[PDB]
Design a protein around this nucleic acid. Structure first.
Lengths: 149, 131, 107, 99, 136
RNA sequence: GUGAACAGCCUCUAGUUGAUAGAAUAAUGUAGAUAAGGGAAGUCGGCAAAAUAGAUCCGUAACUUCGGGAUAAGGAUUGGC
RNA sequence: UGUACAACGGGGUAUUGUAAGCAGUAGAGUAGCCUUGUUGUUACGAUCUGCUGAGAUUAAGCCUUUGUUGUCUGAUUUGU
């Protein structure tokens, strides 16, 4: 079984999903789903399409180079099946993926910090440049307090 | 699915694609083969006057002069600037074979890049001298 | 029993698969049946200010959610209907999302 | 051939492809490779010395944990001449104006 | 199955009916093939005998050498371009239709095969797989 | 207003808002569509549908009453700023 | 008179592909008030980048619900 990625989508293709395409140069183009497949025929560019992962690794979004991401490459030399490798890899894959998420969430906070600065500078323009609307709300509070009275 | 997209993008009427065309420009031997094809009866310009960027045969040498000075052919020049998007770019996006990916990007930056640009410079040096 | 409430109404799950020449006339009959369930009276008077609020984007562009105010009122003498009827009128809001049914106080 | 014939014929005898190969311990000759955990199938992860390469990763936690690099918790806002009472009002006045 | 084909042949999607022009994948000199009938086919009212991947069809040649044209000869289909089902969970399809030509014993006429050869066709016919440069 | 145009589509002045209506969305119809792979194997017969279509530049055969054939055929192109 | 039923709302799944709004030292170029420039700038300027996998839709024959507000004795007929 092979969880191989979409050619266009970079999402996992579980066994039983998606179409394969084979070029006459004989390399295989496995596809996530029909949306990615019909967009491939039409000669698009996933550097340009915003929803795919090839855009997001290129356009300065979600982190691309990491020491945790080099653990799952491919192996063309088979490792002869010792069990005590297998018992640690089932503990390794639960450990690499946690450090992946603690770095990816921390990479998201570098990209979204200081929004509250621009959130508050946006509010100084709305409040201060509308003096006439702020008179209307003052009588709205006084009419609110008087109805309870 | 639709009407217009079926007419041009069936399996029968598929063009070459962007992957192989970057390989043809990347070396000096495959450029000289395609510029100098042996003449064939089953091909539109009788196996001459072939553009390498757009995988497309032209009827006459006049039809290369008017094809290069167009917004259609200035897509494919601007399309083939960078790394040609193999399968390896899509696998690196999921956290899978970075060192296979980053070494190829290292080679396109160093070796394959300026060999391609010194080939596309000579095509404009040749297709202006003959046309 | 004179009671005024607020409501939203999901018209997207009511006008699903209707002919386009009959969407906006159908949305009128849906609000009458929607007021008949909640207020429990038969004859429902829609204000003409709400009739503008349905037909505003044509016959086939009825909005998804509207924000209603429904008041149930006393009726006059020698009406063979009932002592009760509803009077549905709209309240205008920035967006009709994320609101729920609220009783409007009397004064 | 003859081991096949004594228990069933040719279309019904079932060859164990295992029990004929060389491991350092024959006690686990019948066990099962998992081949998949949650995502990212197992044969891309296993190696010689996975845990020894994982020691170098766990050093990079403590090189990044003590530096304040994983600091999600941030609770105050500090502007010029502004405090928590006043910045709450301006974010409450500008919310009223948008509606 | 018939003569030459070792083993059995599973059900795959029937891409090529009668009168379907397909490319020629060897170095024999034919350019396109033209199917007239499919061997091992059924018999039902108003159907067309339809070929698939890894079948043997009787096929004529429209474009090629004048030594080869105007004689019916068997041919084995190696590419389909209609999506079929490998029994591991994937559908797949090729770029074009293609077929090599052979004697009824199943032995190749040319010496090489251009382009990729289908996997189900290469299992069913051994002499194709000796001349196949690329599998899948 | 778009455009070669009194073509077609949209709006101002002026005029109608008349043609039995409500509720449901089975078959078979009438009117209009889209289909993987193959491409006339259908059929008396390519009937019907599809494809081509405006404009600019290049190019254009036999034949002939020299006027035609001719938009012959076949190609390159078309937005916004 | 409650594992009640319904109307909205809140989560979960999915669908398309980055909302309005401001901002930028992005932007082929051209003009100017000129402080006659030593990015001379404010204007115009297709588009691009940032807030933004944001925004919109989500059962009409999807899943789920400790929230909000309601409703819960109408009519007919039947006996060896």
């Amino acid at each position: 079984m092979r969880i191989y990625q979409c050619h266009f989508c970079s999402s996992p293709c579980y066994p039983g999903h998606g179409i394969m395409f084979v070029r006459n140069d004989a390399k295989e183009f496995r596809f996530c789903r029909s949306k990615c497949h019909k967009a491939f025929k039409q000669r698009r560019n996933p550097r340009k399409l915003k929803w795919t992962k090839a855009f997001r690794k290129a356009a300065g979004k979600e982190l691309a180079v990491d020491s945790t991401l080099t653990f799952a490459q491919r192996r063309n030399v088979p490792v002869r099946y010792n069990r005590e490798l297998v018992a640690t890899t089932l503990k390794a894959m639960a450990r690499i993926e946690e450090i992946r998420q603690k770095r990816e969430r921390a990479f998201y906070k570098n990209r979204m910090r200081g929004n509250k600065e621009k959130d508050f500078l946006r509010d100084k323009k709305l409040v201060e440049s509308n003096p006439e609307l702020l008179r209307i709300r003052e009588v709205e509070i006084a009419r609110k307090l008087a109805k309870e009275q | 699915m639709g009407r217009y997209s079926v007419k041009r993008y069936k399996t029968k009427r598929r063009t070459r694609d962007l992957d192989l065309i970057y390989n043809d420009l990347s070396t000096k031997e495959s450029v000289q083969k395609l510029l100098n094809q042996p003449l064939d009866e089953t091909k539109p310009g009788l196996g001459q006057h072939y553009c390498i960027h757009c995988a497309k045969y032209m009827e006459t040498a006049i039809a290369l002069k008017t094809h290069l000075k167009g917004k259609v052919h200035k897509r494919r020049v601007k399309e083939l600037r960078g790394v040609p998007y193999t399968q390896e770019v899509s696998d690196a996006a999921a956290g899978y074979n970075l060192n296979k990916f980053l070494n190829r990007v290292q080679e396109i930056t160093q070796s394959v890049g300026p060999e391609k640009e010194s080939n596309e410079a000579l095509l404009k040096e040749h297709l202006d001298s003959t046309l | 029993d004179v009671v005024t409430r607020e409501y939203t109404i999901n018209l997207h799950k009511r006008l699903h698969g209707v002919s386009f020449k009959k969407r906006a006339p159908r949305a009128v009959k849906e609000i009458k049946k929607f007021a008949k369930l909640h207020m429990g009276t038969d004859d429902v008077r829609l204000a003409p200010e709400l009739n503008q609020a349905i037909w505003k984007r044509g016959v086939k562009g009825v909005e998804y959610r509207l924000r209603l105010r429904i008041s149930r009122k006393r009726n006059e003498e020698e009406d063979a209907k009932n002592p009760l009827f509803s009077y549905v009128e709209p309240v205008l809001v920035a967006s009709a999302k994320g609101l729920q049914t609220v009783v409007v106080e009397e004064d | 051939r003859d081991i096949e014939a004594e228990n069933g014929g040719a279309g019904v005898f079932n060859v164990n492809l295992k029990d004929k190969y060389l491991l350092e311990d024959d006690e686990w000759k019948n066990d099962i490779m998992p081949e998949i955990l949650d995502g990212k199938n197992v044969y891309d992860f296993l190696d010689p010395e996975i845990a020894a390469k994982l020691q170098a990763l766990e050093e990079e936690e403590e090189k990044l944990e003590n530096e304040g690099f994983y600091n999600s918790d941030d609770e105050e806002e500090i502007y010029d001449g502004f405090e928590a009472s006043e910045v709450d009002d301006i974010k409450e006045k500008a919310a009223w104006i948008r509606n | 199955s018939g003569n030459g084909a070792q083993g059995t042949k599973f059900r795959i999607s029937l891409g090529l009916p009668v009168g379907a022009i397909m490319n020629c994948a060897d170095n024999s000199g034919a350019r396109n093939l033209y199917i007239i009938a499919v061997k091992g086919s059924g018999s039902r009212l108003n159907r067309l005998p339809a070929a698939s991947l890894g079948d043997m069809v009787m096929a004529t040649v429209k474009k090629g050498k004048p030594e080869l044209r105007k004689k019916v000869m068997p041919a084995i289909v190696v590419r389909q371009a209609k999506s079929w089902r490998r029994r591991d969970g994937v559908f797949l399809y090729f770029e074009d239709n293609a077929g090599v030509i052979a004697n009824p014993k199943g032995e190749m006429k040319g010496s090489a095969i251009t382009g990729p050869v289908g996997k189900e066709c290469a299992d069913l016919w051994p002499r194709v797989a000796s001349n196949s440069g690329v599998v899948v």
